[PDB]
């Protein structure tokens with residue numbers, strides 16, 4: 055049925071987003087270095103451990119990668135979707151919402167920023183400490 | 188009925204994800220670029236090896252400027268370039284200045300007619316465009 | 323990792339594009355602005371070159387787009403695509419093949435000559451680009467016209483027959499139902515893709531055409547390039563230029579496209595502004611010689627592709643303004659075209675729509691596309707028609723009686739059916755069969 059398809063979408067998609075964390079840091083570094091090189095005209099001398107940490111932070115700054123996807127649909131088909139994908143979506147931690155603007159039988163995917171209280175509570179543990187030069 | 192528009196959402200949902208593939212990849216490029224941006228700004232370096240080659244190339248680039256040409260580099264590349272190519276510059280009739288706003292490893296030649304811009308500042312712009320034909 | 327591989331690939335392909343980036347960028351200097359045309363020096367460029375002029379915003383350095391329309395060997399004559407207010411004496415100038423979005427992505431979309439979205443949606447996903455400038459298809463390696471192209475308009479299909487790859491004119495005037503006729507075709511024409519260039523059309527009418535004429539029906543199978551009357555003539559020409567380029571690509575994919583250029587008059591008029599600005603004397607009508615080098619060029623791009631290929635069948639609207647044929651563009655159109663659909667003002671004011679002059683119109687590929695039994699019927703239809711319109715008065719006074727004139731007698735007996743056959747309606751579709759079979763209900767067999 056359609057069930058497998060939509061569930062495999064959410065399955066596959068989220069899964070791909072997950073794979074990013076393990077495999078995407080070094081990849082973005084190699085690119086960052088190429089960019090630098092092509093611009094400056096020579097390979098610069100850069101601390102790799104330092105640099106690769108800078109990217110992980112950059113990554114943590116994209117809610118889509120750091121948080122979970124938000125599937126928001128039309129209120130009319132709202133109940134219909136949640137009945138179909140509700141179980142599969144919850145497992146992967148996806149929020150779901152109706153969007154008044156979206157047309158009947160239509161769908162839009164954004165990266166949810168969650169709750170203000172949560173975002174704040176998280177920053178304290180990060181802001182709590184300071185490194186040394 | 189159900190199958191009619193319950194598939195609508197299925198393929199609408201499929202299309203929406205496919206839509207992000209270019210957006211998400213691009214977003215990932217932006218991350219590496221900012222890092223690149225950081226390393227560039229982060230560091231000076233003692234090799235004019237590439238800069239010294241570009242200036243050589245510029246000197247021989249035609250058409251030639253008669254406009255009282257002046258080569259500008261960051262004061263930090265200045266002394267070293269002055270030594271290596273400073274004789275050749277004078278032979279070409281160019282003069283040299285420090286420009287505080289040029290990043291290391293890049294230069295600009297200015298005359299009345301126009302400029303040869305070897306700045307890494309403009310090469311970055313060129314780069315970002317390659318990544319975003321929108322800009 | 324189907325999706326994952328897409329991403330990595332996307333990334334990998336960008337890192338290879340880095341190698342390309344230019345080490346150095348040459349600048350010229352803008353020497354003179356006294357008028358629409360600007361003079362720059364220090365960089366030498368080909369005609370059509372897009373030239374950027376740097377304007378200082380304070381901390382921000384904005385770019386003003388500009389184009390090379392001419393030169394004195396030392397000087398480069400630039401024309402702006404936007405306002406030069408705020409440009410300094412001796413401002414910096416540099417040159418930036420410009421890539422444009424092509425593909426099934428464009429379907430359902432409204433874009434300008436630049437390729438930018440006019441419907442308030444993001445740029446299309448551009449997996450592929452192309453260049454406005456493409457080496458002209460060599461007609462040597464293209465294929466002839468064997469196939470009727472169903473235009474969904476009965477009068478055309480039956481009476482003036484067109485076939486794939488044929489490039490046809492539409493001559494008309496304001497208020498005769500030109501815009502609608504085009505809509506009807508864009509909706510009912512049987513073809514893989516519909517490209518509609520709207521060039522020089524009024525801004526508000528462009529919206530009227532897309533919202534209320536093309537409809538969602540045809541909006542969905544159509545790609546709409548729009549350069550209105552407010553923009554610069556360079557941007558209008560780009561509009562026709564970009565419209566043709568698209569259709570060309572679609573053709574290269576095995577697709578059969580309908581290309582509607584509204585209008586060829588405006589294209590021409592747009593060249594005239596530019597030509598005059600650069601001091602090219604108006605040799606023919608007060609239309610400079612370039613105008614007539616241009617029209618052939620833009621029209622020859624349409625046609626059938628490789629055999630077992632795909633094709634561009636086009637309609638280039640010419641606005642024949644007032645009672646006319648004095649107009650050289652309409653003549654150049656006639657000379658370079660495969661025949662033309664002529665809209666009658668008399669018919670339009672009579673509520674007869676689409677108002678098409680079966681007399682004035684012609685399609686040269688017609689006899690090649692139809693049966694002699696059909697072609698016989700065609701001629702008759704016209705002769706009966708002609709008989710009626712000349713003598714239509716006397717019939718009213720009761721002046722005419724049978725036995726004197728065989729045509730006018732037949733014609734006037736068939737008139738309500740003929741009149742009904744030629745008339746169609748905005749939402750009324752006439753297929754190939756529908757048209758042919760309609761013919762039989764009258765004459766044969």
Ligand SMILES: Nc1ncnc2c1ncn2[C@@H]1O[C@H](COP(=O)(O)OP(=O)(O)O)[C@@H](O)[C@H]1O
Pocket residue numbers: 494495496497498499500501502503675676746747748
């Ligand atoms: N097939 C038709 N049936 C009924 N009315 C028509 C038909 N074709 C044209 N008309 C009338 O003629 C007018 C055509 O206007 P339009 O085509 O926009 O003018 P232009 O000739 O400048 O394109 C419309 O207002 C419409 O009422």
